[PDB]
């Protein structure tokens, strides 16, 4: 999620030329400096088992799929994050009152404008019209 | 102090019924406040403990980046203290347009004066209409956001179980 | 605005009550309805359009005068709602000006 | 009532010479500048239907009768104004305690001097011995 | 402070029974107040929270443009605090005739001293007659208005329904 850009230093530390192309020779070099001696055959098996393109070179959003695989968050954390994904359609980290109006139309339960503004304002704490992930969980707690 | 607050006491219909002793007891607790342009008075969410009489200049009331009321000469804003009997947060910022002179009076001092002058307090309640209640929230919609939502409405239970619960909470609200 | 976005609607008001027609749902008199219309249309006729009612055919002339005040104002009062610096008319030099300060020094 | 003197600017704006004499020719001129073309016959009908003197010229208290006709106030406002007219016999906008003593004699219910002074003082707020229209309605409210 | 308020404590029969410690505890809360001629002390309707001992000069008590009591040297006015136990508005203006010296003492401070000196408080209540109760309203009639009303009495249900109601209210008063 937010550590996706924090992995970018590690991903630039992966390749030796820094080309966005995960070489087999560069991976063998970094494992050899790690202290393991793997064969190139099992490293090619790892390439064909990891890469979605699968051409001897992989990218950083091509690793984002494996990052989403190895993420594996909790129960309630994934619940509120998926509720953020369906509840914010733009995914911009904020809940506009018009976004809550659109998901009130898409929920089936239609609410008034005063009630939807009161739901925003009870949800909001800093008071800028949009609520945060923390402001979302602050009412999803109890 | 009565001469300093003559700009309130001669112009307001709430104060045209005031006794002489009540006028002294009010003016000893009034505070004239000068404000610069762009020097706002009440924040969003600040406690509104002082109803202010704008005796000179002009003020604007910004709720959610939108001007909601322009206060001119001789307009009373704040919160209706004697009827509310509780402190509330301000709904809106009150930015100052010009160099303005307000005449504020704190809620505790005004309540003391209105509890002591019981015959005056009913006249005050009947004759002081607040220009802008800072306590009450004004619901509206922005035209640009309504236009964008109309564009999105022309373009368009596993989530509902942790969501409709909250909805029902809001139904109990 | 200062950013040239529209932010307010100024709508200016006047009375064309005496200059259109009297119409009443119920009244003591047609004369009373006329009296109420003359009491309404005051700011134009009793004050601004005072050279009109001695002369005749003054309806278009009074309407043009009352609308022409606001029509000249449609270019004059474009106050633009900006927290701008107050200005003197030109060919009047400021007191604390840098040129005036070095002029006073020389 | 209080707008009677505020109509005096309109009444001086009615006549062209400002003589206290509503001319038929001046009325035809001001209607012609208004944008209506009435005949002088219907304007003479309006003169004979309006004026109490009825001589081709009317006065400002001669219009005060039509003003009292077209006043037509509310129920409770006319009630408290007529109660002011019977309750203040001088009509001076104030209620002296001796005026309340005279209307206590003319009411039939006679009260003591202490009780009538207490009625004045409970009625009065600014405390000058006389009460106002607003001080009258302040006890006539509840 | 006892030497400053000796002009009260040697001349008043309420204070001729005062203990030495009670005299110290009173004089530390007394305030000598000088007033100019025409510089009035209590407004009409002002709160009477301080009984004043006129130790020098003369005062007049104007209720409804009429002098009601002249206070001279060694006269006590104000409100009987220990028996009233409530704050009241002043009935009358108290204009100052000459350059006068009063010795006021606030109601709260006097009540503190009289609650602590319980044996003295009964003597104070029995021996301090107030020269003029500022709380109590004095009913009277002006001779000119009585003469004019006699002239008018020699010269002289649709109204009664919104009027007799109030009358009956005053009967319930």
Curated annotation (Swiss-Prot), chains A, D:
InterPro entries: CALM/Myosin/TropC-like, EF-hand-dom_pair, EF_Hand_1_Ca_BS, EF_hand_dom
Residue positions, PTM Phosphotyrosine: 94, 133
Entry's localization field: Cytoplasm, Cytoskeleton, Spindle; Cytoplasm, Cytoskeleton, Spindle pole; Cytoplasm, Cytoskeleton, Microtubule organizing center, Centrosome; Cell projection, Cilium, Flagellum
Residues that coordinate or bind Ca(2+) 2: 51, 53, 55, 57, 62
Residues that bind Ca(2+) 4: 124, 126, 128, 130, 135
Top-level lineage group: Eukaryota
Keyword Cytoplasm: yes
Residue ranges occupied by any EF-hand domain in the UniProt entry: 2-37, 38-73, 75-110, 111-142
Quaternary context: Homotetramer. Interacts with MYO1C, MYO5A and RRAD. Interacts with MYO10. Interacts with CEP97, CCP110, TTN/titin and SRY. Interacts with USP6; the interaction is calcium dependent. Interacts with CDK5RAP2. Interacts with SCN5A. Interacts with RYR1. Interacts with FCHO1. Interacts with MIP in a 1:2 stoichiometry; the interaction with the cytoplasmic domains from two MIP subunits promotes MIP water channel closure. Interacts with ORAI1; this may play a role in the regulation of ORAI1-mediated calcium transport. Interacts with IQCF1. Interacts with SYT7.
Role noted for this protein: Calmodulin acts as part of a calcium signal transduction pathway by mediating the control of a large number of enzymes, ion channels, aquaporins and other proteins through calcium-binding. Calcium-binding is required for the activation of calmodulin. Among the enzymes to be stimulated by the calmodulin-calcium complex are a number of protein kinases, such as myosin light-chain kinases and calmodulin-dependent protein kinase type II (CaMK2), and phosphatases.
Free-text comment on this protein's domains from its UniProt entry: The N-terminal and C-terminal lobes of CALM bind to the C-terminus of KCNQ1 in a clamp-like conformation. Binding of CALM C-terminus to KCNQ1 is calcium-independent but is essential for assembly of the structure. Binding of CALM N-terminus to KCNQ1 is calcium-dependent and regulates electrophysiological activity of the channel. The C-lobe interacts with KCNN4 channels in a calcium-independent manner, whereas the N-lobe interacts with the S4-S5 linker of KCNN4 in a calcium-dependent manner playing a role as calcium sensor and gating the channel.
Protein name: Calmodulin-1
Organism listed in the record: Homo sapiens
Curated annotation (Swiss-Prot), chain C:
Tissues showing expression: Detected in cerebellum, at parallel fiber synapses on Purkinje cell spines. Detected in hippocampus neurons (at protein level). Detected in brain, but not in the other tissues tested; expression is highest in granular cells of the dentate gyrus, in hippocampus CA3 pyramidal cells, and in cerebellar granule cells. Detected in pituitary.
Top-rank lineage group of the source organism: Eukaryota
Entry comment on modification after translation: Channel activity is regulated via tyrosine phosphorylation/dephosphorylation by SRC and PTPN6.
Localisation: Cell membrane; Nucleus inner membrane; Cell projection, Dendrite; Cell projection, Axon
Region called Required for phosphatidylinositol bisphosphate binding, residue ranges: 34-45
Family stated for the protein in its record: Belongs to the potassium channel family. H (Eag) (TC 1.A.1.20) subfamily. Kv10.1/KCNH1 sub-subfamily.
Task performed by this protein: Pore-forming (alpha) subunit of a voltage-gated delayed rectifier potassium channel that mediates outward-rectifying potassium currents which, on depolarization, reaches a steady-state level and do not inactivate. The activation kinetics depend on the prepulse potential and external divalent cation concentration. With negative prepulses, the current activation is delayed and slowed down several fold, whereas more positive prepulses speed up activation. The time course of activation is biphasic with a fast and a slowly activating current component.
Protein's UniProt name: Voltage-gated delayed rectifier potassium channel KCNH1
Full-sequence portion shown in this chain: 118 to 223 of 962
């Amino acid at each position: 999620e937010e550590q996706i850009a924090e992995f970018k230093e590690a991903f630039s530390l992966f390749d030796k030329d820094g080309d966005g192309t995960i070489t087999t020779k560069e991976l063998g070099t970094v494992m050899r400096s790690l202290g393991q001696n793997p064969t190139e055959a099992e490293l090619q098996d790892m390439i064909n088992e990891v890469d979605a393109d699968g051409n001897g070179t992989i990218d950083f959003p091509e690793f984002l799929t494996m990052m989403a695989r190895k993420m594996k968050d909790t129960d309630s954390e994934e619940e509120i994050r998926e509720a953020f994904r369906v509840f914010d359609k733009d995914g911009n980290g904020y809940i506009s009152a018009a976004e809550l109006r659109h998901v009130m139309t898409n929920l089936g339960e239609k609410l008034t404008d005063e009630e939807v503004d009161e739901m925003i304002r009870e949800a909001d704490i800093d008071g800028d019209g949009q609520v945060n992930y923390e402001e979302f969980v602050q009412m999803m707690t109890a | 102090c009565v001469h300093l607050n003559r700009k309130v006491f001669k112009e307001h219909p709430a104060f045209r019924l005031a006794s002489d002793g009540c006028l002294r007891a009010l003016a000893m607790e009034f505070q004239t406040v000068h404000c610069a342009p762009g020097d706002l008075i009440y924040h969003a969410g600040e406690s509104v403990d002082s109803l202010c009489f704008v005796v000179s200049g002009s003020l604007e009331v910004i709720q959610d980046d939108e001007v909601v009321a322009i206060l001119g000469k001789g307009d009373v804003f704040g919160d209706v203290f004697w009827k509310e009997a509780t402190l509330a947060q301000s709904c809106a910022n009150v930015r100052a347009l010009t160099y303005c002179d307000l005449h504020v009076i704190k809620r505790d001092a005004l309540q003391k004066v209105l509890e002591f002058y019981t015959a005056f307090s009913h006249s005050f309640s009947r004759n002081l209409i607040l220009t802008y209640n800072l306590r009450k929230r004004i619901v509206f919609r922005k035209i640009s956001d309504v236009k964008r939502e109309e564009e999105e409405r022309m373009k368009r239970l596993p989530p509902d179980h942790p969501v409709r619960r909250l909805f029902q909470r809001f139904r109990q609200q | 605005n200062e950013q040239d976005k529209v932010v307010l609607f100024l709508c200016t008001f006047s009375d064309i009550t005496a200059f259109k027609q009297p119409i009443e749902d119920d009244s003591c008199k047609g004369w009373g309805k006329f009296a109420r219309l003359t009491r309404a249309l005051t700011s134009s006729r009793g004050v601004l359009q005072q050279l009109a009612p001695s002369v005749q055919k003054g309806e278009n002339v009074h309407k043009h005068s009352r609308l022409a005040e606001v029509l000249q104002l449609g270019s004059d009062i474009l106050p633009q709602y900006k927290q701008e610096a107050p200005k003197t008319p030109p060919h009047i030099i400021l007191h604390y000006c840098v040129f005036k300060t070095t002029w006073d020094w020389i």
